[PDB]
Amino acid sequence: PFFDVQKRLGLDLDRWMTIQSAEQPHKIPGRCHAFEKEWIECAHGIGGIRAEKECKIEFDDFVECLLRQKTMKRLSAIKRQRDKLIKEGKYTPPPHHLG
Amino acid sequence: PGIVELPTLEDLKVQEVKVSSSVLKAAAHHYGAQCDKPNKEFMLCRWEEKDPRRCLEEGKLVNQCALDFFRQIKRHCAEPFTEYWTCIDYSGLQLFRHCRKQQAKFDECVLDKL
Amino acid sequence: AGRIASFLKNAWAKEPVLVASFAIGGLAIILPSLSPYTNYAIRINRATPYNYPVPLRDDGNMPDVPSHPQDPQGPSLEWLKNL
Amino acid sequence: MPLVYMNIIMAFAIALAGLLMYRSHLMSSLLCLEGMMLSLFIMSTLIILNTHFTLANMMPIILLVFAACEAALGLSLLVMVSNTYGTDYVQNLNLLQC
Amino acid sequence: MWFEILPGIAVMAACLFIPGMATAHIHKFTNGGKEKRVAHFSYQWNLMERDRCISGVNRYHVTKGLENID
Amino acid sequence: MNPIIYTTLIMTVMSGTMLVMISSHWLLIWIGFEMNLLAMIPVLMKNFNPRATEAATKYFLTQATASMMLMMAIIINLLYSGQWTITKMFNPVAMTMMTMALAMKLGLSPFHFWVPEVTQGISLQAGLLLLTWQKLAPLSVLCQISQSINPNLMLTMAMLSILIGGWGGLNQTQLRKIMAYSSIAHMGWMTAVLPYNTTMTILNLLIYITMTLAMFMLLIHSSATTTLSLSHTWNKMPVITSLMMVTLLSMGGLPPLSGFMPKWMIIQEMTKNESIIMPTLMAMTALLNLYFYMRLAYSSSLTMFPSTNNMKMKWQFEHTKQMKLLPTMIVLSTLVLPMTPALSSLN
Amino acid sequence: MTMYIAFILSTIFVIGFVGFSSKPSPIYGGLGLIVSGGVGCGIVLNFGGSFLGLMVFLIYLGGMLVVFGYTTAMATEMYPEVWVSNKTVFGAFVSGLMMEFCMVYYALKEEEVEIIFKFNGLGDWVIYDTGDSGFFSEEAMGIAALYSYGTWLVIVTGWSLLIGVVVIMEITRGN
Amino acid sequence: MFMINILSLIIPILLAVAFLTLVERKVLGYMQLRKGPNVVGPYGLLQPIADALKLVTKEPLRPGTSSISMFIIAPILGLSLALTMWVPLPMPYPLINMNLGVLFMLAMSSLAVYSILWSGWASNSKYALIGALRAVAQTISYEVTLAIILLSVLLMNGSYTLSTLITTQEHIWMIFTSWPLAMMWFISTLAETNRAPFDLTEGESELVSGFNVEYAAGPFAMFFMAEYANIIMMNAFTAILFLGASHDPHTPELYTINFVLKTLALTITFLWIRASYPRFRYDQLMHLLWKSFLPLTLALCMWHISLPIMTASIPPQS
Amino acid sequence: MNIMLTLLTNVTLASLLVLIAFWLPQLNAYSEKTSPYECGFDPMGSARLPFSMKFFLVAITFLLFDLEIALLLPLPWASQTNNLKTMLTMALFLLILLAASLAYEWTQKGLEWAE
Ligand SMILES: COC1=C(OC)C(=O)C(C/C=C(\C)CC/C=C(\C)CC/C=C(/C)CC/C=C(/C)CC/C=C(\C)CC/C=C(\C)CC/C=C(\C)CC/C=C(\C)CC/C=C(\C)CCC=C(C)C)=C(C)C1=O
């Protein structure tokens, strides 16, 4: 906040939605609750300058959980390689993954 | 950036209880009271450890205690229970509100026989 | 009294809908504070168990928390049955 | 970041491009203005639903509350420019060149 | 007279009766007698999916009572 | 417009800007901008002249486009970070989208062809309110997000503003038009120092607010809108235009007038950051701003201009309106250099 | 074929988006927005947002109705334009269709699109999450908390809309 | 077994409107001392078929100034919207068990007006544009009361699911708790479907046409069958929402019989008022809603938000 | 699946009825049968020139009021909260401003239709 009246006046106006690990209705946790919880607990009061260099892997795990960028990339490679291998005829899916 | 220690398939080969959702919905209250101890222990492991891969055995105890609950019900009140869960199953929403009479047969059966 | 009664009677003649709507609109705000069942509505909503009542580890010295659902100690809502 | 994100992000670009190329109509211009609002609402809905950001599900609603509010402002402005100048092509209001 | 109006109602009332009866009977016919299970929430759907897996024949309505376990 | 509605319409504008400077949530910041735009459009077309309608219109499409781009840049930041707090932007495209999204609200780079004629069409009263109050909100957002700002883009935003603002003002006669380009010139000055020290642009904002305020309500008192119409004020009000000299000199940064305090203090800060070529540049191109200030100074009372015989009964009557803080505003707008170290109060 | 309706629905969303962004006659622009708006509601419904999907359906339909209700009121052309009509709108239209159809071709043939951000084609069904929702829909409870957790948002939204009626009359009054 | 279900709904629906046109004149005539159609078949039981068959064999023609595309799609919009809207109606068990059935019907019913002016605008006629512009502001202003009335009543439901009305008014009819809202709900339904205290959409006395301005055999048949289907439902929706009926889970036929009877009685009332009142002028029908219906609408809304709280009767969400 | 099949069947049924509408009845038409209808005598040339109606002010407030009903739509699920006092105060607050907006719109000509 530019002029932090919420901190001074000691009431909440929007510091209840700004994060995913806040008190959600009926304690419905978000997808990446644990990932961001570690990240915020990591860089709390340390400052933005120190946060961007020290709490880096915690952010990367959290940002990955948000998008699954690498995990979906891993799945994309599994399916593509499986497709060409099955199409050529080296190996066929086992009966558990048919029914 | 590491490995994933997926448990042995053998560990995921415990007895798989086989009753339809209406059967469980009929047992409900009586199951909850007479099978709470293994149930609570398993979920506390679930909430504390936050990892089912560390709480399979507590899951197994639930299945074994669930079997004993259902093993007793067949031995003593198989017929009224069969009458009851059938009456629940007919409803599309499985409401206890429409099968009070069959419930009255069921609870008195297990009360004076189990 | 004379000023108010003349105004209410006059509005009751020309624009019955407005004086009507302002009535129920007025009552819709002031009774809910007065009526005593508002606390019951909070209790009913609070008592509804959408989530699991997650068990809390027993390290002793928790006399009020029951060990079994049928135990007498704990939040009892027999008032709902009576109400 | 699957292809549905590409579709609505690339969509918003054409809403941006569509707005920034006024050809002959204020009304059609306002259409592209409210067009932007779809992709923003739709993308926002996809985000907080995918992430289960339940408390933030109100954000698409508040977007819409302030959405039509601008939409009303645009047509109300369009009322007078068309009323006192006849049409809504955005070329006849160049009296403010000097 | 006014009773001549009634044939106008009757051929409509029967026609409007069909969708109520057809939907009610089709659901019962296609779900083995019992009403079609309604899943307004994910928990209801979870019971239905477990019913499909448990039945073996991949039919949610096909129900197994106590006799499945022993 | 009825007086009571006008007040509440203004209060909504101040509340909308205040919401921007106190909220920590990105959605609320966007809301504060939306409320600011919504309550201002009626203010511009208060008198309902034909000009004001498209003047208010050009306001609307420009800022709505800016608001929509700002919303989009917020959304991407949420997508890649899951955060609504105003700390920094974790997607470079998200930031590189907001700079222009905020710029068009400020009117700095070629996102500026709305500022001149929107000032021209609307009345002088809303012109003052447009060029001073409407800049606290977008600048406040920039100050908070000042950490994650692309210096190459932000500096170019300001450098373009100074050049165009100075160049454009040389070919303007309508006093409102010259004020808009002059304001655009000061836009670059405040925004150039933004990446380095945010305390400095606050200081330049405060000085520029006093300059634009004091200049405008002098124009209101003179009741003039073109250079020729201002010229005759020497016959009626000599002190107003004589005071207008010092404000014009101060607005050009000619020291020891207060207007030097930003231009001086800013240059000192960037040279601390090894920026030398660029600070020399705006030092050079601030002079074209000074040109049409002196031409205004020459035309107002430095050389008494031909008058009109209809001015006799004009001298027989005095102003009934009561501009306040005008005697105060001139003091801060002219002589506060001895209190320069007071910038640390902002810090 | 029912592989994943998300792309197909979003494609019609873009093609409908292309339409009114090409600057037709305003009435035909309403149709181009409505198809995109209707299918956009379909996209959100498919993602679990049942309430929000029909929500944008009801509001927008009323929103765009007064839009082209206005165009025939005082923004109508004595000879209205059409999708073909002038070569400019024809050029603006066909440009949009060929554009989007190029990106989707660029999208579905390598699945590693890197325009601006990264876009990999693997199926929007993947990003879904495994887990129940109890006896409540998550979206409905989230937007229900507006009256309990969002009392600040209600105030600013309510006041702005009330001011919204004030400006609309004040702008449109005149004289 | 779903195509059979759908075609077990579409055919009965189109046959219901089919003979509603016979029970219109045969009721309208008897209320104006006439006798109605009793020549084509016994008691007129074949007149609509004779009407329909003619209306698919007499020369259709697009207007010379029409817009072909929008002229043709408007009947598609009217008919498909009317049919698709019956889908979530909970006759014992609804065909499609939508979780938000109420919101669905509100959305699509708000869409059935795009047909009326797309037809009006494309027809390029002076009476067409007048009737189109009459209707749009007529419906949307009547839509604000439509939305709030539904919300205020459904606050006792606890959800928007249409099936829950069966459970909600299980012991007591809903009208006995919301009769003031029932009156404006019935009037609004008379207004959205354009029956004749507010049939100004057609405006035959002053606008000769407007439902179907140059529209001919086929397209005229659609724009008729698309609004007479709305007549039957908007009373079926009124019946399901206010006048509940006993529903035995084992024998749904009793509920369907009861549900049909309420729709039939309500539909007769739609025909009954149609021949007992003059025509509202445009400003009057707008004044009635914006100046008399809405103030009572909001006031009774605030009552129904507070009422469950003061009486501790918050309905179950599930 | 179920919803889209129903949507498809309706549009095919409607479109088929159009197809048999324009093809089964054969046409013997000319340029005078396609003339626009104007109750007999020749039209003066209209139906596309600006036809300015008067309820534009209340037409656009409907859009504003339709946003109010969007804001107060989630009320059925809002009652299922643990802090009804705050929910009741806010729920009535939106209704009050909705009433207040209508009342102020009423007083200043507003709903009156321009002459
Ligand atoms: C001012 O106020 C006013 C009003 O009121 C307020 C009014 O009221 C009126 C109206 C005036 C009056 C009432 C006065 C008297 C006038 C009349 C009665 C006019 C009568 C008008 C009519 C239209 C007659 C209506 C009567 C009848 C009998 C209609 C009967 C209906 C039919 C013959 C059709 C019924 C439906 C059928 C047959 C459907 C068949 C469907 C199928 C076979 C299946 C189709 C679907 C499929 C096969 C799906 C599968 C296909 C797939 C999947 C294809 C896939 C394809 C791929 C390519 C993929 C006016 C004028 C008015 O001024």
- Angle between helix axes F175-192 and F277-285 (nearest 10 degrees) is 170
Q: Name the residue facing D58 among G103, G108, G142 (closest C-beta).
A: G142
C29–H308 C-beta distance less than 8 A: no
Nearest-angstrom CA–CA distance, F339 and G4: 68
Cα distance from C49 to chain A (closest Cα, Å)?
10
Note whether B touches D: 3 CB pairs or more under 8 A: no
Q: How far is residue F256 from each of residues A11, E68, F185, F214, F249, measured CA to CA in Å? A: 45, 97, 20, 18, 10
Nearest-angstrom CA–CA distance, I34 and D13: 44
Burial H184-204 (b: 16+ CB within 10 A, else e): bbbbbbbbbbbbbbbbbbbbe
Best A33, A65, A67 member to test D by mutation, with max D CBs in 10 Å, is A67
Please tell me whether residue F226 adopts helix, strand or coil conformation: strand
- Angle between helix axes G26-46 and G50-74 (nearest 10 degrees) is 180
Please name which of B20, E7, C56 lies closest in space to residue H45, comparing C-alpha atoms: E7
Ligand 1 pocket check: which of H3, H57, H202, H280 to mutate, most ligand atoms within 8 Å of Cβ? H202
Omega before A25 within 30 of 0, i.e. cis: no
- What are the two backbone dihedrals, phi and then psi, of residue H211, each rounded to the nearest 5 degrees? -70, -45
Separation of F227 CA from ligand 1 center, angstroms? Answer: 74
How crowded is residue F237: how many other Cβ atoms within 10 Å of its Cβ?
A: 21
Cα distance from G39 to chain C (closest Cα, Å)?
34
Instruction: Yes or no: say if H90 and H250 are a contact pair by the CB < 8 Å rule.
Output: no
How crowded is residue F300: how many other Cβ atoms within 10 Å of its Cβ?
A: 24
H221 CA closest ligand 1 atom index: 23
Helix-then-strand count for chain C, H and E:
4, 0
- DSSP assignment, residue C71? S
Touching chains, H (3+ CB pairs < 8 A): B, C, E, G, I
H227 CA closest ligand 1 atom index: 8
Q: Report, in angstroms and rounded to the nearest whole number, the Rg of chain D calculated over CA atoms.
A: 17
Structural domains of chain G, count: 1
Nearest-angstrom CA–CA distance, F59 and H93: 55
The answer for residues whose C-beta is within 8 angstroms of residue F59's C-beta and 6 or more apart is: F37, F40, F41, F44, F114, F118
Nearest-angstrom CA–CA distance, I107 and I111: 9
CATH of D3-92, one of 1.10.287.3510, 3.40.50.920, 1.20.1260.10, 3.40.50.720: 1.10.287.3510
- DSSP assignment, residue I94? H
Token pair for H228:
């007479």
Percentages helix, strand, coil for chain I (3-state, rounded to 5) are: 55, 0, 45
- What are the two backbone dihedrals, phi and then psi, of residue C56, each rounded to the nearest 5 degrees? -110, 135
Q: How far is residue H207 from each of residues F19, H24, H222, H231, I33, measured CA to CA in Å? A: 52, 22, 20, 22, 20
Cα four-point dihedral sign D61, I62, H278, H116: negative
Ligand 1 pocket check: which of H224, H225, H273 to mutate, most ligand atoms within 8 Å of Cβ? H224
- Where do we find the tokens 């909430």? B47
- DSSP assignment, residue E5? G
On whether any CB of chain G is under 8 Å from the CB of A11, the answer is no
Chain G environment of I109 (Cβ under 8 Å): 173
Q: How far is residue F155 from each of residues B101, F151, F159, F263, measured CA to CA in Å? A: 81, 6, 6, 16
Cα distance from C65 to chain B (closest Cα, Å)?
14
- CB-neighbour burial class of residue G160 (10 A; exposed 0-12, middle 13-18, buried 19+): buried
Token pair for F331:
């003091």
Cα distance from D79 to chain I (closest Cα, Å)?
9
Instruction: Yes or no: say if F142 and F195 are a contact pair by the CB < 8 Å rule.
Output: no
The H residues from 155 to 174 touching I (CB cutoff 8 Å) are: 155, 157-160
Largest CA distance in chain D: 54
The D residues from 29 to 88 touching I (CB cutoff 8 Å) are: 61, 64-65, 68-69, 71-72, 75-76, 79, 82-83, 86
Report which residue type is found at F162: I
Nearest chain H residue (CA) to C32: H310
Cα distance from I17 to chain G (closest Cα, Å)?
23
On whether any CB of chain D is under 8 Å from the CB of G89, the answer is yes
Nearest-angstrom CA–CA distance, A3 and H44: 80
Chain B environment of C55 (Cβ under 8 Å): 40, 43-44, 47
H249–B98 C-beta distance less than 8 A: yes
> Could you list the residue range(s) of the whole structural domain that residue G121 is in?
5-173
Q: Whose CA is nearest to atom 57 of ligand 1?
A: I12
DSSP codes, G113-175: B-SSS-B--S-TTTT------TTS-HHHHHHHGGGTT-HHHHHHHHHHHHHHHHHHHHHHH--
Please tell me whether residue H141 adopts helix, strand or coil conformation: helix
Helix-then-strand count for chain A, H and E:
5, 0
Cα distance from F165 to chain G (closest Cα, Å)?
31
Instruction: Yes or no: say if H174 and H241 are a contact pair by the CB < 8 Å rule.
Output: yes
Cα four-point dihedral sign I18, I19, I24, I29: positive
What is the residue extent of each domain of chain D? Answer: 3-92
- Where do we find the tokens 């609109």? C25
Residue by residue, what is the 3-state secondary structure of chain B? CCCCCCCCHHHHCCCCCCCCHHHHHHHHHHHHHHCHHHHHHHHHHHHHHCCHHHCHHHHHHHHHHHHHHHHHHHHHHHHHHHHHHHHHHHCCCCCHHHCHHHHHHHHHHHHHHC
Rama region for B14: left / alpha / beta (φ>0; ψ in -120 to 50; rest): beta
How crowded is residue G150: how many other Cβ atoms within 10 Å of its Cβ?
A: 24
Nearest-angstrom CA–CA distance, H178 and H168: 13
* Reported structure resolution in angstroms: 3.5
Note whether H touches I: 3 CB pairs or more under 8 A: yes
Instruction: Yes or no: say if G84 and G92 are a contact pair by the CB < 8 Å rule.
Output: no
Please name which of A39, A31, A46 lies closest in space to residue A60, comparing C-alpha atoms: A39
Best G35, G41, G50, G56 member to test D by mutation, with max D CBs in 10 Å, is G56
Ligand 1 pocket check: which of H2, H211, H267 to mutate, most ligand atoms within 8 Å of Cβ? H211
- What's the length of chain I? 115
Residue D33 CA to its chain's centroid (Å): 2
On whether any CB of chain B is under 8 Å from the CB of H93, the answer is yes
Separation of H57 CA from ligand 1 center, angstroms? Answer: 14
Residue by residue, what is the 3-state secondary structure of chain D? CCHHHHHHHHHHHHHHHHHCCCCCCHHHHHHHHHHHHHHHHHHHHHHHHHCCCHHHHHHHHHHHHHHHHHHHHHHHHHHHHHHHHCCCCCCCCHHHHC
H249–B91 C-beta distance less than 8 A: yes
Token pair for B59:
């899951």
Please name which of G72, B71, B97 lies closest in space to residue H318, comparing C-alpha atoms: B97
The answer for residues whose C-beta is within 8 angstroms of residue C26's C-beta and 6 or more apart is: none
Chain G environment of D43 (Cβ under 8 Å): none
Touching chains, F (3+ CB pairs < 8 A): A, D, G
CATH for I1-108? 1.20.58.1610
Residue by residue, what is the 3-state secondary structure of G45-107? HHCCCHHHHHHHHHHHHHHHHHHHHHHHHHCCCCCCCCCCCCHHHHHHHHHHHHHHHHHHHHH
Nearest-angstrom CA–CA distance, H168 and H171: 8
How crowded is residue F265: how many other Cβ atoms within 10 Å of its Cβ?
A: 18
Q: Name the residue facing H124 among I11, I47, I66 (closest C-beta).
A: I47
Cα H282-H285-H287 angle, rounded to 5 deg: 100
How crowded is residue G42: how many other Cβ atoms within 10 Å of its Cβ?
A: 22
Nearest-angstrom CA–CA distance, D12 and D34: 11
Nearest-angstrom CA–CA distance, F11 and F19: 12
Q: Name the residue facing G167 among F34, F39, F48 (closest C-beta).
A: F39
Residue F67 CA to its chain's centroid (Å): 19
Please name which of F6, F16, F24, F21 lies closest in space to residue F63, comparing C-alpha atoms: F16
DSSP codes, A61-91: HHHHHHH-HHHHHHHHHHHHHHHHHHHHTS-
The answer for residues whose C-beta is within 8 angstroms of residue C73's C-beta and 6 or more apart is: C63, C64, C65, C66
Instruction: Yes or no: say if H260 and H92 are a contact pair by the CB < 8 Å rule.
Output: no
Please tell me whether residue H230 adopts helix, strand or coil conformation: helix
Q: Whose CA is nearest to atom 52 of ligand 1?
A: I9
Nearest-angstrom CA–CA distance, H190 and H197: 7
Chain H environment of I10 (Cβ under 8 Å): 10, 79-80, 83-84
DSSP codes, I7-31: HHHHHHHHHHHHHHHHHSS-----T
Q: Whose CA is nearest to atom 24 of ligand 1?
A: H52
Token pair for F270:
């960037």
Nearest-angstrom CA–CA distance, B107 and F165: 88
HSE value, Cβ hemisphere, 13 Å, CA-based, for G46: 23
Chains B–E, number of C-beta pairs less than 8 Å apart: 56
Chain D environment of G37 (Cβ under 8 Å): 38
How crowded is residue I47: how many other Cβ atoms within 10 Å of its Cβ?
A: 20
Question: Which residues are near ligand 1 (CB < 6 Å)?
Answer: H 7, 11, 14, 18, 21, 24-25, 48-49, 51-52, 55, 194-196, 199, 202, 204, 221, 224-225; I 8-9, 12-13
Please tell me whether residue F25 adopts helix, strand or coil conformation: strand
Please tell me whether residue F85 adopts helix, strand or coil conformation: strand
Please name which of F81, F204, F192 lies closest in space to residue A48, comparing C-alpha atoms: F81
H63–I34 C-beta distance less than 8 A: yes
Cα distance from G88 to chain C (closest Cα, Å)?
55
